[PDB]
Amino acid sequence: RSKIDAKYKKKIEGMVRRPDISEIEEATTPCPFCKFLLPECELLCPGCKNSIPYCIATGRHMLKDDWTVCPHCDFPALYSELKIMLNTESTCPMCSERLNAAQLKKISDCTQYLRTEEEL
């Protein structure tokens, strides 16, 4: 409380003196390890206790039906989302190499990135 900027302190105090519980529910989507539904930005699955791979473009948990990888670094992204952010900036968010939206490929088999790592 003592370290907060005085610009925001009165607003932060005001939000605690008058709680507003209204909040847009995060959509729940299937864990790629066990199909347990959890919020798009929740990455430790409570259904299987695995840390899920994350989209390098948006940080949501990866989905088996929208998978791609950066060609320079092999890290996973949501194909729709990485294509969208490459219209905003000319570089990978992960490796900082230059990219073009035409270099992206959608992946039909992500299972090599999803084997529970005790098997490796």
105 close to 66: Cβ distance less than 8 angstroms: no
Radius of gyration of the chain (CA): 19
> What's the reported resolution, in angstroms, to a tenth?
3.5
Cβ burial of 78 (10 Å; 0-12, 13-18, 19+) is buried
Rounded CA-CA distance 101/114 in Å is 25
Experimental method: cryo-EM
Phi, psi (5° rounding) for residue 76? -75, 145
Three-state secondary-structure class, residue 37: strand
Question: Can you read off the two tokens belonging to residue 116?
Answer: 């529970």
Run of H or E including 113: none
Three-state secondary-structure class, residue 38: strand
DSSP 33: T
- What single letter denotes the amino acid at residue 36? F
Rounded CA-CA distance 21/27 in Å is 17
37 close to 30: Cβ distance less than 8 angstroms: yes
